[model samples]
Target: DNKVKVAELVAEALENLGIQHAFGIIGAGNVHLFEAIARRGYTEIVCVHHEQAACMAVQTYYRTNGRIAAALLTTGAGSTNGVTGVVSAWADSIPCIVIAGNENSKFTFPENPLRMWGVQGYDSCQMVERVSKYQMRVTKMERAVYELEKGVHLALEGRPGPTWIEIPMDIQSGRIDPATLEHYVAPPAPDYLTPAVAAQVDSVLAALAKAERPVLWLGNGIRLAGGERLLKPLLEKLGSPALVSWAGIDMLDSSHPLVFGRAGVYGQRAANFILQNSDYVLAIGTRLAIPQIGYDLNELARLARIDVVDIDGDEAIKHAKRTQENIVCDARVFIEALLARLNAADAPAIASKADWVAKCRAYEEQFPWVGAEHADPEGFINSYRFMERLNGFFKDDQVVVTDMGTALLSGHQVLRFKEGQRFMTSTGLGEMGYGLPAALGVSFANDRGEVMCLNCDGGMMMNLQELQTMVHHNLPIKLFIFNNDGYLMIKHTQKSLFKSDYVGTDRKSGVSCPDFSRLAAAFDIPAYQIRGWDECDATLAKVQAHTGPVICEVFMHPQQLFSPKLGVVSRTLVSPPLEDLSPLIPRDVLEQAMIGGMHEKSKTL
Candidate 1:
């Protein structure tokens, strides 16, 4: 048996690696580790309502501030719940270190407490091990600090994803001498940008200079890379107009002269013009995918030569299949390095194509925030109205997480965002049901605890049970549901492209339904059911005033789909073959609506 204690040593290891906060629900299994974190005073173990939310909060911390954010959760169900939030972070490539508490080694040891007793402690590590990049099951007392520091470094460095360190109860309580800790604490290599790599970035700048027209596109990767600051300077350097990815709405100032706003489905018309017209495109910190850049990659890339830069080298390698000329470095480092070489190079600052910039601005002015212009424009549940109201209330420090499909289009394209606030949502995979869970995770990690989730009706139902977890934990979470009664994206597509033969999009048939308001009521939670915009004012006040989990069923149009992420097939969708499988509005009728729907390429304000 060892004579020393491990509680303080583990806390020091986390602190040395630059973790200032550890987010988690105070579960019984991890109480020793929690106390350890508190004792050192270097790390603050934040209180969270649910384990999953705790994981999400730390992941948000990782995304918002580039670092290895950590989370501690109890063993068994606690660990299980926490992993769901990190799934998005893993998909998006955010760095997070999750220390999950586990059963004592003796509980599973031969002739131990569980085997003969048929107790629940079968194998806790195996579950989280599958999901995380690095999974460590600490068996010996001596290896605790070393394994933890390794986990932190690994999570922060390289491709940067989550690491699950399953700390057994005994290992946590066991003593780890400073000599042992020092042996474990290996000095990490300094992260630096090489001049050679910076030279290569200069070459890309040369390519842009040679081209007559060039556009800059920033994605969630920019946020991940902490290059949000470099965007303005880069744009100013080349007078390079910029369009943001779905998760990159706040990357650039919307009022910036070269602003193209969002790039994907809900992208601005002026931005798409630059995309379609540009001779060269410098896509930074984005994969240039269908959702962020729209479905027509080649077509989107047709107007210009596309260059992709990303934080994860593997990400660059993976995207190399689509486009070559990879600059695999951190976003800020790459931009700063490139900027350094650029000034030294004295590359003539090309006069911006005033015509090109003017054209983009003209288009933005013409259809700025046109979410209101839709088929059901007169409906009480207009999507644009909801976002406008939401924009007014949400602070610059708030975090908003979205689900995929229509929610992405509506939220990404239209929602008003303040710089420095976070916008986390799934793209590339377009996974559904990500909002509520992701929001919960974000709320826990944010210092303000002031986060809002605008989740779609269809997506919210996927893991609606998590709402109870929010209430059980008394999380001050606010959820605004776009209660359109179905998967609006497919429904809108069916109406336009599929001849309105709408099927499988309705909630009333072929699907079990729960009254959302009633579900909240059963939880003794307060909820709102608004049929029109009249309630949005006082409604939010009621919802926000309630301390625990709050929900609101804001009426929205399922038929009105977002426009920016529209595909090529949709361009001709205005005139579908008549007498087609008649499930939708008439083709002639649709064509008439297209009178103002199709935004002209060289359109005037």
Candidate 2:
């Protein structure tokens, strides 16, 4: 009776939101939606080999930018396959939508939620409730559009997370009139940042004014706030040394004069020193948790007075034992407002910590990460130097995604980013197989199909099935595999912290990785292998220029080492202080870096 069907209306609403891509595999439950989507001729549907990959692609799509991406899947098994990716998105606070199809509502009664369990139906709404900000199963055809509008809105609203909407087959194929139905008019975007309170701003300024040494700590919240670009000038004006949580490593250029680098389990020594020694700490858009300060928050609390700015009050005050003041506001707004206040109030040129900056830089130079000391002349390739070397090959516009294991640690330690470049991974979830599919999503998100995935031998195999999806779609992804021969992080942990009876971390231990280049070749993809440092540039260039999906596998030594790593001795009752990373520098170098009341006051835990 109408030109617009229910499926067409769904597709139209997604298009209106500026969502252009939907990734998933089709089945009986979702066949009608596809017919309407194809008939609408608007949004592009990409059929991935696995629904897991589809959700992961959408996850990466949101990571590259704020615009929402969606996934479509069928009932039961299809629903479970995509759960990990949705959880990953929820963990990272990436906004996305998942529309799943279920069996018709006629046979499914409210009295028995799983009335016909084996009949192509599953309670997907119940399964996804924990991961999604919103979840709904539409019983009536008339309510379908209303639920979708609410689901997407909630998914994008405050502290963004994924949302799920499950529609039955009958409702999807049901007749509907677009003009008669109440249109889904989206509300104007809400103000994400809380208004600045003068009292809180003044309190922060008073701390800055009094303290001789202040440190700016950034977390992933800065990235979510879209405020990375504003950080350089803020650091320049404040003259405070900076440290980053793992989630916020990309907020500042590694080469910035005021920037010291990331502070974590694998953080650089100098960065940790500055964090532990500072008199005043300005933690912005970060939850100061165990990872940044080791297993205990008391170590950081004992060092200095901490002022925090975050969108959520709970996150701002999580480390309340050390917090001097908590200003709950968006990071971008707080920093911008702080800059304006300083500029207008006739404040002193705050770049007053010349001695502080010099000492940090001195330590940075005195103890090099991958220079002459840590050079690898005997191995297939030096992991440390390879990461540093790969930095040059990347352009400002390129996007890089990494996996959770050793690849995450290595990239965080070495990769430096320009302003336009973007980086992401499954951080909170710590899952493998996220990089390749996420990179595929990034490729689709951009106008130009160019992306890179940094994956390790063990992690890459988790979703190796996606290789064929990339080849079929002709996604221009430069796949770089850091072949360390096994799960190096786990192996290193077992060797150092536990009795070295390692399980399935290597070929000898019942686990093995295939020749990645040949594996890519089997999918009709171009492939190359790098066995040493000498061939890195030429091989990377060859792979980069191929203009299609190409794989480059770098063979690294099985016993590759991560220098200046956090100390972990399982024999002790308490963990060491975050300030003392392993591969310790000479005492003289430490003394030089800690000059102005700069030594640690808290005893090593």
Candidate 3:
């Protein structure tokens, strides 16, 4: 009476951990486990065409609602196929589980191993060992439940990431006694904010109170730590200008009083200028990685006394020589402690930096990122203008998913998120073919809400088969394809470095794309096309009017450029500081704006 199949136990364990959705493809190696999950009927299983899509979908599901999902795969090839999504999840610190089935236990070699003993047998745990936060091979049925719990616990623990578990065929069908099964008992979480860390917080406040120009740099960890709700109040309390990394774009609305803009390589001009000028900067929940600080680390907040609060000690340690102080703690815990101190009996009165705020606002107004130049020539719709107009149609409740290349870069540069709206994209792994599948996850997470996917023609072609999946489910997704003939980002790189010798980037080169409208029609979904600027808004209106799944292809110029980007100086072989963007502005104007003197190299350039 106490006996149960190992597959059933695993399924029960997953359900017990509150996983409500799973995406995968079924095969010989995983049929038993798949059947067990399907039979349980508690979790919704989505059968997808590609294993990669299944992984990407689960990744987005977690990103959308902070809820974990599972990606189920079968055997060697199936497991390998999902590695891209796992890598992406690992880079972005999303907490999800990947359950991959393997060959029978008899074929696996623990001590002496053969390269290939069983058909389709491979060491999946080893393949993903470096990327995953936790990995296991279920060799013993008695310890299966314990392993599962430990994997989940580690995944959701400090600096969340993906976990992988490989269940062999024999283990899947093995009989086990539930009453005798081993269980995992988790140790208490470490209190990151100790007396030492508390003293560091006091030092940060003292620095903030003494400085005339102070800035707050927000990052993705704030959202991961369930700290978004506290952001506005914290900003209100500090009254300092704020800048966000690409991952933290939607943390505060563009129109918020204290928000300057996003900063880094392709960052806003005003935000970069304001950050460079600050005398003090308190960066919270961010690694301040190279992408956000540019290749030249020395120039980033060079004049500011920088302090960082992060959950991972390893990440904080990297900044030890660069930053004045580092507090290794969870974003929520650090913010709450800071707030509690602010509300205490001996709290310092923080006077609003009104003049500093006005100067930053002036910079924002003076150099508008999007302007009349983006409207462009008569024949093609400028990608920037399209994104600018598209931003207006997004409602507070909707979720927007973007793919890599021009779509992701332009979207980050132009789109201004509303307060309640959500944005999803692959930042660290920056893969193509993420938009369409990711939209499916958003739709599922938001209960079939209208999910908007912004994709480029080249990226859309990468996972074109998912179109049928959307049509089959009748998902409420509005897909907009920026048809710029081919990969515009790569083309730009070629144009800049290769003397316009392009290959494998467009139709004239090696790459080619099919008509998206016709492709959508083949899937029996409504389709629309915009050939010029005149047809842009009207086509968007038609797309917004339709509630069900639809695709709109906007034909754009082949040579469209992403402006306000950092330019490499060929003579000096160095990039100018973040404040000095491309399509170069006057040297005197830049010098006058920078509170600290411009970088020596930037001044020379």
Candidate 4:
């Protein structure tokens, strides 16, 4: 038999699955697979600075691009760091494949420390079993493909999630046949909606039909299955107002007129009011999580005649106990079927009240509120202005990716999304440092359109190394570092609730930036900085003009905060109105700042 490493088989399996790139921890055991992927010429192994960041990157990649990211971590501690990022994947229903090294059966049973040094060498399958949707410890190379197939399927099918497998370090360097790679299979196309059960789902639709002051409670369920197909038509017909769970931001565009915006902390005032007033709620694809309900399950259930929809059959029964009515079926299919039925039959004369939409729009405008009444009136570009301009200026052809914290919140409020346009952020899982790696992944999956990534300075620092990857690859992804010196969101809240005793929020902020423009310059990538608010537009124009990758570091005020915010404690609590301040400094300060920092074009952020 010709000698072939098991690593080659794993890499070949990934290629066969059509994975374009993988972010993983390089190790002696996994080098074979890494080399194999490199040999394929279609895949690149992103050597992440840390395993958690690698996994975070994959999750980000999955959010914008529907592909499972692969991770290969070393034994024990390395695998643990790698798996922390997996939680984000699971929480957000993003698919990721986490492969870790372990002692083969040959060594796992021995008292040898290299194979059994305490629990580290014993095997980590148990550590990840409960966390991962499907966990496997591969002993036989013949069964590897089958196990791999199942893990991939679980990570993509139904409610998509993360999956894990521990392929013994010894076995990775062992031989396996290449022909067995053909056994890999992807999840089946979503064609069939269970008929009888689908009929049962109509009960939820019936309630939606009867609703007068209606609220569509959207959840992660709707997002995983793609809620637009089901929602757009029904919304068009009923013109109903909707509320999205924090996890359900995927269901409706954050900037959409119909959506009441994210419920729970930071929920729009109008949405909270609608919840209080609406008589019926068409709960689609959510379990109605705690913080999502503002910690009042009874009140949430009492807000309206609740109708719960879930994918799991058991989840349906549990929801029935929670709400008056519930349905169990695939999220996407149920929405599609409801649209088909609602369109075919004579639907109720439901005309969505334009007042509600207008009120929500007004609420949105009022938020991240600008004016000298709150903040100390700095000449910096207001958060609202940056986001509003971004929402309006960005063409429909642009791709927007965001990192974590308030910068994402700003984008969530300001950046408008249209059909075929993509909005990506560290959502649901609340993962920081995910933006940069994901931006790299986005560059790989999509070469068309202007790929722009928005991230907080704090969030950007975690995976700042991705800058190197983007530089190396020369992917034309635009980077906007919302350069608020530190965690402004934390500082603001501390000031309000903690007697102004700021802690864990300040970064000793000064001119200690890593010279991002020079960083990009070192990579031979185009880079620009925005010192004043006015220079934003022209700087962005210059970035567009650049043929390769571009970076824009916009100097934002640390005092700039999202208004109508949900405090760390209560959904009702808002930050004490910003300390009074002026908005946007002098025009020349803005203009000259642009000339000094950026190329010829303008970009305001």
Candidate 5:
């Protein structure tokens, strides 16, 4: 009988699914599986320093191609190390396969502990149960192939999320007869939105048609549904102002005329006002979470009549703002159907929304985000100015992956996304050190694409070991470090809310940062530091012109602050409406931005 190890079958299954690359570290308990995967030469396991980074790589891989990728983790500690990234993917609904190794099933009974004398025999499947959409522990070699196929299908089945499976060491190395093994085949992806929700789409379109002020609120729903391709046509057809949640930031280019920028606590003032003033909001695939509502659900609810279209009924129903109408369906299917419905005979003509769009543009022009005031440019560049320059720095086909904290917040406001670009960051998990490692995955996934790992000093230090991995691969990743001394965002917020009593935030406060340029030099990668804006253009020119892996540190002020912020007082109860963010836009300027509309003001408590 033709026979193959369970490990080989698993690897072959992954290859059959067309997964070309995986990220993880090889270690005990999984060595047999690793060796099988290596011998098959089907998937290249790109080894990372930590297991978490491997999971992150897969997360970014899925983000890149909208396809389920894989991550390999050894038993116990190795598997546990991947928990952070796995949960991050789970929180954001990113789909990927996490193949974890486990201690021998012989020792691990259903209710019994696997270890009395060992160290690496922890029950990894139990640990991952909460975070994975589908999880299984393969006890028998015969069941390995079935469980392996099950995980892949389950991952891609519903709202996409991480799927986990643990192969016991003995079973991983155990042999199964090829002819005797069950041929597991995944069923075709079911269309949950079949028959169409024509009535609901029509009702929403009617409301939008009559709306004096209208908005198209988008979320990660489109990305998750692979509905991005359908969104542009719908937007052009609707011709209403569009506002995106943090997750939906990449849906439309920042330059799109209808785009009023992002909506949230740190959202564009124009976006917040547009959403608040709009009489009807078509919130497709968006949750209308606290961040988008300025942490004030009541204000947002009172501001507009919302129509929510979401695949997840739970998310659609539980939204903070009360939606006037709801359509529980797939976003991609809904958008396509809506566009079709709009073009049909007897359908009402979608409004031009020309006046509403003009007001949105005026708001942006009246209340501009800029240098000085809150932003201070000290070292080689002004963060605000630098972010603007970055808008044009990368060509349309490249990628920008940012870390958490100030880099994300600042870039969210300043960096303008171009067409055909992929921007990645951890919004739900908001984990630091995610950029550098995820950048590695981006590099591996898009070999011909230019990649930028935009990270802050503090976050970069967390996973600096991966610099060696990048160097080993010789990936031409342009590592851009926002070299503020330490946790700039945290420290800046502390001064405003914590009475200026700071600790462990920067070198002066107790936390110290290494000379990043010197550190990069040790990795044998060329390094450069930009201190002032005067040298910024010339220095950046060099970075773009460089042909190999290069680390560039751009310096900024310690006191550099983010502007057009939602006030702290507003969060505490005494505040203007969500539309009225802090630093107060000077009453009349805001009123002017709301032309032909009444400027509503709230009493501060």
Candidate 6:
């Protein structure tokens, strides 16, 4: 019998699963497993400064290339710190595998366990149980292979999410017989195009055929299910407006004729208007959460008959808005079935909604989110204008990543996504420190491809330490830090609701930001600062010319307001519908935009 360590078996399983990279911090408990993984030479280990960054990098790696990466952490604090990124993965439905080391089996059990038996011993599985699709603690050497395979399978199964497995120190070193190990065999793929699913697809098509003003609402699930390839033909056939959520920003190119831009709380004005006025909405691969629709679910597409398709049954049934039909199936499967049926029939004659598409285009041009006027402000770089200029500089091959707060909102509003370029941010979790580390993962996944990262001062400070990781790797990542002094969004909220009182929001308050350019110099990376619009073009040119990691500190006004946002009235405590954005358009103009009469509450609220 060939004998192997349990650690070796785990590494072999990961290698077989096509895992090429593992991000982690090495420590006492995980040293054995780490050594085994490194010894295999099939997986490359990226040692990050912190566990959180490691997990974040792994999550982005999956998001960028649709490949799984493992996040290995030591016991106790290492595992606890990793929870932040794991939660982000769970929130965004990203597939991740997390392996943490634990105390020896001796300390783990005696029929009754003592909490403080082993140093740095923690039940990491229990800690992440809620966020993971599957979690297991490998107590016996024989069960290690089975648990690992099962955990990986579950991670990639329905509506992907993070999975966890913890191995005790003794188990990591314990001997196991290779011949005796029972390998995990995944079940065969189900026939997704079942009779019932085909009927549901037909019903959805029938609804679209009957709809006069129809729209397609897409979400991240399309990308998750690999249905992006089917979108072009489907859009051409349907000839209707296509709106996306923030997570689905990259699904359609901004230049696509049918693309109507993103729809959400901070969504485009044109997108919101089109979404609100449509009579029929076929929303696929999205949960249509509060951010996508406002707090008042009843007002979102109120006149529209919405049919939702999702991989998760629970998500479909518990949709926030009233849905006409909740079809529980993979987005790719549904699209394939729909396309097959449509291709068989003679054009299906889903009448070209050319007038409706023209209306959406008119709105898009009429309400330009950012324009020459946005650049008129002197002595400071307007966030919208900066984003608009930056959009042209991006090449199709580069992946753009943005952090939370002002940078994210402004980028979403103004950045025009190119056909081949990819855009991703921390959407569901809205994690502040996501941009820099996520860029690290993107660079690695793309074979050290050039990356453009946008971060604000406040969000940049959250993971400032990752600058060292970026510099060390010599990754060509152009990091632009939008310096608004502090948390501009928080300050704006405090000023609006708290009568100008502020705390922990700026330098005068409790929080303070370092001079990011000087900090970049400390990391041995090139630094550039854009103080005003005059310096913008030249500084961006220099940053673009340089090859390796560089930081550009873009200074903007702290008091600048994000235009066309959903506003709540203080007295009524009511938020206007998605169509009626703040800095309100005229009543006559809004009334003309709506097919149905405007909601009476929107007038006063």
Q: Estimate each model's TM-score.
A: 0.80, 0.93, 0.97, 0.81, 0.94, 0.97
User: What's the CA RMSD of model 1 in angstroms?
Assistant: 6.0
Question: Global CA lDDT of candidate 4, please?
Answer: 0.65
Worst window of 10 by summed lDDT in candidate 5: 596-605
| Per-residue lDDT over 1-605 for candidate 2, one digit per residue giving the tens place of the 0 to 100 score | 55556887788777877778888888888888777777777778888878998888887787676667889998777788899989988877778889998787775444665655548676888887888788888776777778777888888766678999998888888876666555445688655434446568777877886677788898888777788778888888778788877777667776777888877677776677777777888988777766677777676635578888877767777767768788877777778878887888576445378777777777677655555545775756777778888888887687889987657887887777766777788787878899888888898888437998888899888888888888888889998888876888788877775666767888888778999877887899888888876778998778777789888887888877776676663334445567656665554555555533323422332
Per-candidate Cα lDDT values, in order, are 0.66, 0.77, 0.85, 0.65, 0.78, 0.84
Error of 5 at 69 (Å): 1.8
Worst 10 residues of 6 by lDDT: 108-117
Per-model tally of clashing residue pairs: 9, 0, 0, 25, 3, 0
Higher TM-score: candidate 3 or 4? 3
Model 2 misplaced stretches (Cα beyond 4 Å): 107-110, 113-118, 179-196, 345-351, 371-373, 570-574, 586-605
Model 2, residue 110: distance off in Å is 6.2
Q: Which order, best to worst by lDDT?
A: 3, 6, 5, 2, 1, 4
Instruction: TM-score for candidate 5, please give it.
Output: 0.94
Model 1 reaches what TM-score against the true structure?
A: 0.80
- True-structure lDDT of candidate 5: 0.78
| Local lDDT at 336 for model 2 | 80
Score candidate 6 by lDDT: 0.84
